[PDB]
């Protein structure tokens, strides 16, 4: 991805964040320049758990089709130590038709939100012995309604629900097509996008950057030079 | 407490939350009819957990001037079993110069977050061995920003703003008096307000009035349901 592309994304993710009367903190908005002057004793847990800014295209070449965009607004240690938090909140822009590929996670369990927009369409698989998918009923609880339901079924989240997927049930989801974006919350037990999210696909979670003109923003997993 | 008050409370904060384009899911419209005709069986989460609307006057006379309306939208049990989920969320509505009255948990672990509105007026203190408030200096993150400030300190949360506090800090808060009514959310380990809530004044309860038919069901009131 091209640095170019990531600030045009963000500006536009801020744009429809502020549409949805969303509003982040204060370092949501820093410049790198404004990250340079911070006193780096005080905002070590911003760096240390990486709140934040995130873009990926997963490994891939086409973000419209396959992409993220998120805000990491808090979060505790993936041990436990030094910070001892044991839930994490993201904010997040499903562009129309856009997907995040199928995944789970060894350790989070996280409820994913629709907050507002188009319609998110999330397809759900056991994963078996083989980390393949597999042909099992899953049980799921959308807002504290238990169900049941075949392997691979694709589950409609219209604004105000959500979803609770426990760790090892493989997810993708995407924003209906022609429904519009989805605003995407997350409320989960600790995040850690390092080590815990295991892809069906082999893909890589973050993306390296053609720093092609001057970064608006800073990333989340790119604040080790300013701490 | 009129449940005519209770519906009309309930009426404007739906309203407050749709004019910030707040979503809330199915159950949060259900009329006590709807309740009536739920498979028990498969919605026990709700109901084990207390999730959905809270209006509370703190067991006092004057809403307007102490109170709170809360949506408890997600949980998990008090002692990890049976519900495993680690974590609980609430969207709240703080009217103008509403107070929530001075407080610790024991156990709950909360980020408060100004999602939108005024502004968020945050009062700490640590608790004393002997549950009273402390004069030591408060240490507190606000989103990220680790800061030091002095025993009984009034911090102001702006609309995306949010701090974190640990178990045992004591806290009250409201809206900016003038600045206008404030959505709150709280994102925080298990929700137990049967059993985790320290008032610094203990809390001394309201029955209700049904002088009117209830247009919803509270979180307290699941028993008939169930
Ligand atoms: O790529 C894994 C990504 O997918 C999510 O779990 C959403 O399901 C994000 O929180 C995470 O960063
Ligand atoms: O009743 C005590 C209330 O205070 C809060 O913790 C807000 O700080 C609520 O979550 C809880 O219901
Ligand atoms: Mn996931
Ligand atoms: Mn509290």
């Known amino acids: 991805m091209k640095r170019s592309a990531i600030n045009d994304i963000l500006g536009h993710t801020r744009q429809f964040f502020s549409q949805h009367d969303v509003h982040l903190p204060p370092f949501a908005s820093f410049s790198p320049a404004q990250w340079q002057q911070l006193d780096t004793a005080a905002w070590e847990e911003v760096f240390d758990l990486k709140l934040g800014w995130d873009v ?7 973000f419209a089709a ?17 910070y001892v938090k044991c839930y994490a909140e993201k904010i997040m822009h499903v562009r129309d038709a856009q997907v995040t590929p199928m995944h789970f996670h060894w ?11 188009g319609n998110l369409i999330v397809e759900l698989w056991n994963a078996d012995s083989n980390e393949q ?8 609880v959308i807002d504290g309604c238990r ?4 392997a691979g079924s694709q589950l409609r989240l ?10 090892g049930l493989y997810h993708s989801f995407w924003a209906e097509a022609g429904f519009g974006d989805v605003l ?11 080590h815990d999210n295991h892809f069906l696909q082999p893909l890589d979670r ?3 950057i053609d720093e092609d003109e001057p970064a608006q923003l800073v990333l989340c997993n790119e604040y080790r030079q300013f701490r």
């Open 133 to 140: 998918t597999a042909d099992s009923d899953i049980t799921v």
């Open 107 to 117: 350790r989070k369990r996280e409820d994913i939100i629709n907050r507002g927009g």
């Open 147 to 150: 169900q049941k339901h075949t």
């Open 184 to 194: 995407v919350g997350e409320v989960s037990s600790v995040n850690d996008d390092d």
């Open 158 to 167: 219209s604004p105000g629900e959500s979803i609770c997927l426990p760790p």
């Open 66 to 82: 396959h992409g993220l965009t998120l805000f990491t607004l808090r979060n505790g240690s993936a041990k436990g130590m030094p």
């Open 56 to 62: 990926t295209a997963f490994g891939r070449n086409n």
């Open 206 to 208: 973050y993306n390296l």
